[PDB]
Amino acid sequence: LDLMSGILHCEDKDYKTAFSYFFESFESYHNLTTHNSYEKACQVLKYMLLSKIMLNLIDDVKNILNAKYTKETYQSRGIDAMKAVAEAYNNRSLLDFNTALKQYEKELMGDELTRSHFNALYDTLLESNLCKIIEPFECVEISHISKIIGLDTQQVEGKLSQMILDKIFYGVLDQGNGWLYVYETPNQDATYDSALELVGQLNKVVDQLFEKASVLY
Amino acid sequence: MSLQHEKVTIAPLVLLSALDHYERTQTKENKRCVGVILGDANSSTIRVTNSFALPFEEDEKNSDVWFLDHNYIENMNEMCKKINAKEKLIGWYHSGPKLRASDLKINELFKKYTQNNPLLLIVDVKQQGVGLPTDAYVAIEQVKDDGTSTEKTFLHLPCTIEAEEAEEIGVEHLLRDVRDQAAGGLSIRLTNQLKSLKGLQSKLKDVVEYLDKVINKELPINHTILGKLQDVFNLLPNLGNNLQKALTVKTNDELMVIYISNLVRSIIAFDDLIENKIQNKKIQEQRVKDKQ
Amino acid sequence: IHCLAVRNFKEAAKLLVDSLATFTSIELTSYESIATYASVTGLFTLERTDLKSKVIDSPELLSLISTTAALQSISSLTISLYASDYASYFPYLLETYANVLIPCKYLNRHADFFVREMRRKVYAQLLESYKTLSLKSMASAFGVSVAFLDNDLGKFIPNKQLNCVIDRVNGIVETNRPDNKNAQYHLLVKQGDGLLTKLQKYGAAVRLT
Amino acid sequence: DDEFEDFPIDTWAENWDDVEVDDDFTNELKAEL
Amino acid sequence: LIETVFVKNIRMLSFEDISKATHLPKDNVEHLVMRAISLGLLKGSIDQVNELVTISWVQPRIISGDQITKMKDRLVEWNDQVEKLGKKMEARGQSIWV
Amino acid sequence: KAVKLGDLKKFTSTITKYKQLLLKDDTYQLCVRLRSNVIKTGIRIISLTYKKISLRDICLKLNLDSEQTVEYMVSRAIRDGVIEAKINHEDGFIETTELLNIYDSEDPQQVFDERIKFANQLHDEYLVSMRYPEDKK
Amino acid sequence: AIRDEIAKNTELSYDFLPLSNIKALLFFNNEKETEKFALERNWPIVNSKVYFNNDQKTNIIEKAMDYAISIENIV
What we know:
The structure is cut from a larger assembly and holds seven protein chains of seven kinds. With 292 residues, chain B is an alpha/beta fold. Chain B has helices at residues 12-24, 71-83, 103-107, 165-174, 185-215, 223-235, 242-291; strands at residues 7-10, 34-36, 39-40, 45-48, 52-53, 91-94, 119-123, 134-142, 151-157, 159-161. The longest helix of chain B is centred in the C-terminal third of the chain and has 50 residues, at 242-291. Chain D starts with 28 loop residues before the first helix and ends with a helix. Chain D is rod-shaped and about 70 Å long. Chain D has one helix and no strands. With 137 residues, chain F is mostly helical. In chain F, strands 1-2 form a two-stranded antiparallel ribbon. Chain F is 65% helix and 3% strand. In chain F, a hairpin with a 4-residue loop joins strand 1 and strand 2. The interface between A and C is medium-sized, with 32 and 30 residues. Chain G: Keywords: Proteasome. Chain G: This is 26S proteasome regulatory subunit RPN12. Chain G: Acts as a regulatory subunit of the 26S proteasome which is involved in the ATP-dependent degradation of ubiquitinated proteins. Necessary for activation of the CDC28 kinase.
């Protein structure tokens, strides 16, 4: 029940509750030992690690991997695959994640939830890598970015426009020859917003005060 | 050796005792008056708290004919310790008006009685000055500014007059006829600003006069003073460009804040006027319907 | 509903988006029309993040999209805007204008206001990312003639609604990035002037009395 | 209280801009090609 | 380098001027200023795309008699400016200086 | 409306139509002087939305005549405050510059000074009116 | 008056204006008078290519002091 509640919760992209459910299921399956207890423990380990990954927390992933009994007997090549995906997400390298997925596919395309989630994970990793390569640049060339990421110019341009519209990095794309001017985040000083809210409140105070003055008139 | 000469704090009692001493011994012109500056030390901020008279004597002659009683210092020390053991000798003061020749020489006499480096306190007892009439001068040894033998000379320290609970009460009572207790905040801050500007002008004029003296060779050439002046010139910012734009944008923001605050004040005055008119109308109605 | 009626759409967006979950007031209107109004306001006001979490993924709308042609058209327009489907955006906008705004009551009086701002929103979305877009490329993307696009875009620039300057000699639509400090200062000056005039009038009224 | 008889009353024998309408632009001539 | 900075003045410089005044090639001026900054002579910052070496506070030098007159005149001008500003400030706000 | 659109034909039509009503209010003399402002605002519209615009297109969008008249009007306009632009005779293009950021100069100083003056005098008369009920208290 | 008004207008708008076009812009008739008029306005005539080239209150201090005075005088 806990395992499948976590499974259904993962479809809602909420992972803290999913992580709690998966950890309880893993403890329950680790206590007893039947013929199918090992398989259930491995599957729930995969599910908890998958749920943990999309909310970063890579150090905690390492801690769970280095937990003694988890890596004593419950350690397996599938958990190796998932930890490789974890470290690829840590390094924020789409090439590393793609290599890990292609090499260790047998442990990851199965458990349909894992693959359906890993599609969005791939999108997130693409965005993160496009964020990392852009950080040390001001006027990077689109061709160089495509070479580094290994993607195509059109797809890179579309993804860049999508992230710019979502305000992930405050650069401005240009069609001159493939330049990607990168600008620091704007300031929008809080003093003026506070002053405007003050002005509205004082307007309302003026109307109320004049209403109070009706008895005087 | 203790380096405690960063800050000097004087209670008003020491200074007023200095003035009383000067007016008591009937010192005429050119006759300096000297006493001891009992206080507490061994911290960064040297603090002067109590003083007493000394039988200092000197003829206006060869600087080595100065006379001062040795037994009096220890005799006062014993009685003051009996009264309060928390006040220890931390040097001496002279009744101004400015540093004399024997100041370095006589300071060594107080070396044994004092524990740290003895403290000199100049007191403008006849009040020719405009700022604080007190300044500290700790005798320290440093290399000559002319590239010659290291000299043990005096160093000026920033002296601030500050009172404790015991003496603040008396100071506030005594001058409770001239101090403007109403004053106002912004007005007093602006007055302080103007006083600081006038002090800057006075110090600038003094420096100009000293340079005018040195070009005529009435004084020798000190390379340390000239180097400090050149550093002052180097540190002078150029405004009349990026700094100008930053200052302008900050001033504009700051004026906008001022505008908002004035608007708030005006609306507060509006409510006060409305309430006062309401109360006046109620008072008029009260008198009218109670008379009739 | 009242806020949506009198040209506000700001509070209306929030309250209608919230009310999609708890709507027991069937005596005002059917649930389908409430969904239509909420989708319209959410599209018209919300930013590219709020659209992703309030109008395009809401299960209440997801279960009801395939139930009414008006809802289908509005949802298609919203998903076209969010998915950068700039090719068919204008025909979808015309279909929504024909099927969702004029037939209703609280929206038909605002048929012009909603349509004008939709073009502004799509132009802002297109010109936020690019900085030296060509007029020919823009016209091809929107499936319109270049001259018509220039005529349409010449209305949002003078009022400083959009952010660009049209270089007609070459066709470049080079972008201009403003500083929010300037706009905030102008807004504050205007609001202060209004409040001060109001206060002076009220004070003149009350001091004579 | 003044009647302002010098200035006679003239005899006769949520909104800002948006006084023009775009109409049906369509522009299907682009779709023709 | 130090004497040319102190004579030609100018908070900026150029690679060609340093090369001509130090006889080094225009490619070794950079290392020269590296040594100069590291040893504490100056506190500037290099710029190679456009050779515009920027200079800030320079190591002090013993001041001769002639320099006193210029510094004295600059002092006089500064003091006169300060006095004028003080006079204007005092005259304008005499109603609140209490 | 005619001024906001900056169209001389509509302005002329309105002036001719309501001439009697405009003179009966003794404002027709003032209103005919609006003709220059129509040109000024038209040039402002076609200069805020065109970084580099051909002179022929300026003439067409202004409903006017051969290049010389447009050149004269533009040269008049740029030195009359509005249109911080620049005309180059090479190929008929008015390469207008950007607008200087107003929050970098002394104009906000003047605006805020006027506002502070008004608020302070308002509070002063407010207090002087409030003071009488203090005796009436 | 028309010519000097046009000269004032042109002094700020055109940069690097050829004199041949100036001759017709200023409504003149012959080049010599155009050159004389340009010399009167002190425009350089380099290769017939005219290059035009070309109290209220103390800021901060006066305003701040006056605000302080207005605040404290009424008190």
